[PDB]
Amino acid sequence: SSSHFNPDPDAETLYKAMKGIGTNEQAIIDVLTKRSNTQRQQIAKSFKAQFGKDLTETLKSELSGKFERLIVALMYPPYRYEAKELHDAMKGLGTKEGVIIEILASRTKNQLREIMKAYEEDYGSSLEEDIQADTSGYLERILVCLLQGSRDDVSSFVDPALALQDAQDLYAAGEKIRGTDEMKFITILCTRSATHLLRVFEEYEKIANKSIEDSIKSETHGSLEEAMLTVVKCTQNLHSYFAERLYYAMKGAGTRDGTLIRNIVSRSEIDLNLIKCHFKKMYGKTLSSMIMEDTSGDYKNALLSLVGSDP
Numbered sequence: 001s002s003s004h005f006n007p008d009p010d011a012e013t014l015y016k017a018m019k020g021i022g023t024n025e026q027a028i029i030d031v032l033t034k035r036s037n038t039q040r041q042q043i044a045k046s047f048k049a050q051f052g053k054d055l056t057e058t059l060k061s062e063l064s065g066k067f068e069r070l071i072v073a074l075m076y077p078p079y080r081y082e083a084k085e086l087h088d089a090m091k092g093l094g095t096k097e098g099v100i101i102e103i104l105a106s107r108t109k110n111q112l113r114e115i116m117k118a119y120e121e122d123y124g125s126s127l128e129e130d131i132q133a134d135t136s137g138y139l140e141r142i143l144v145c146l147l148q149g150s151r152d153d154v155s156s157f158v159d160p161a162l163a164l165q166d167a168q169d170l171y172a173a174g175e176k177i178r179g180t181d182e183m184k185f186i187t188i189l190c191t192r193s194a195t196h197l198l199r200v201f202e203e204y205e206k207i208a209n210k211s212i213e214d215s216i217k218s219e220t221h222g223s224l225e226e227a228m229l230t231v232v233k234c235t236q237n238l239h240s241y242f243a244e245r246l247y248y249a250m251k252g253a254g255t256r257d258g259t260l261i262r263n264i265v266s267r268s269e270i271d272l273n274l275i276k277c278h279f280k281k282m283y284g285k286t287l288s289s290m291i292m293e294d295t296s297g298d299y300k301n302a303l304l305s306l307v308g309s310d311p
């Protein structure tokens with residue numbers, strides 16, 4: 001699709017869709033959900049050159065509700081999008097700790113470096129400093145650690161002696177009776193590579209006769225538990241993590257639309273095809289069927305256009 005692209009006609013379609021009295025929402029869906037993010041940026045530039053207004057600001061004014069949130073989300077470049085989500089998680093009343101955990105645990109070091117740069121450019125403060133001020137306790141420690149390198153950019157070579165020592169230390173940390181040693185869990189889970197951690201989880205099972213997930217579930221609670229389990233799930237299979245995130249955004253009463261939007265939008269050009277496959281395998285139904293059950297209107301139709309064919 002990106003073999004060679006003139007954005008001008010698409011910009012004109014959007015102009016006609018919003019100009020005057022009445023809004024053609026379907027024409028907005030047909031352009032923005034069928035073009036790539038980079039093509040959208042070209043469309044935005046053409047729109048401003050031709051018509052003198054910023055496309056995103058125009059979209060924010062012309063549209064409302066969930067449909068507006070989704071369409072505007074599509075207009076953010078990668079990394080800047082996550083920076084906006086993280087800012088929104090902290091700037092309001094309360095902290096949306098779940099948003100922060102998801103992004104920090106599921107992104108790679110190099111992705112996080114880009115998100116950190118975008119966050120400082122757009123909001124004039126350091127992401128790490130804002131997290132330090134807005135969170136506390138052990139949650140604060142793991143989140144800061146995930147940003148503070150927490151690298152791997154790995155090999156396939158794991159040090160077997162260190163993997164065994166890490167597993168021994170995790171076991172010992174769980175076994176202390178007047179307070180789990182949370183810092184030992186945090187350091188190993190946040191500073192070791194994914195490949196090393198997979199071996200640690202294997203060794204931990206042999207030593208402890210308990211899965212690492214069940215140990216975390218019995219030894220921790222609340223946000224710290226969520227954060228640890230998220231690191232574990234992302235290490236084992238990232239695509240499966242995102243499927244589960246989407247499932248729980250929709251399961252039961254109501255919808256966590258913020259979570260649905262963010263995960264579909266941010267994964268749309270990376271692994272949404274694998275997420276769809278994993279969703280089917282894990283839950284015995286398609287992603288689209290749950291979206292159809294939980295959402296309505298132009299919002300629903302835009303989500304389904306993005307997801308694409310889902311037999």
Ligand SMILES: [Ca+2]
Nearest residue numbers: 250252253254
């Ligand atoms: Ca629901």
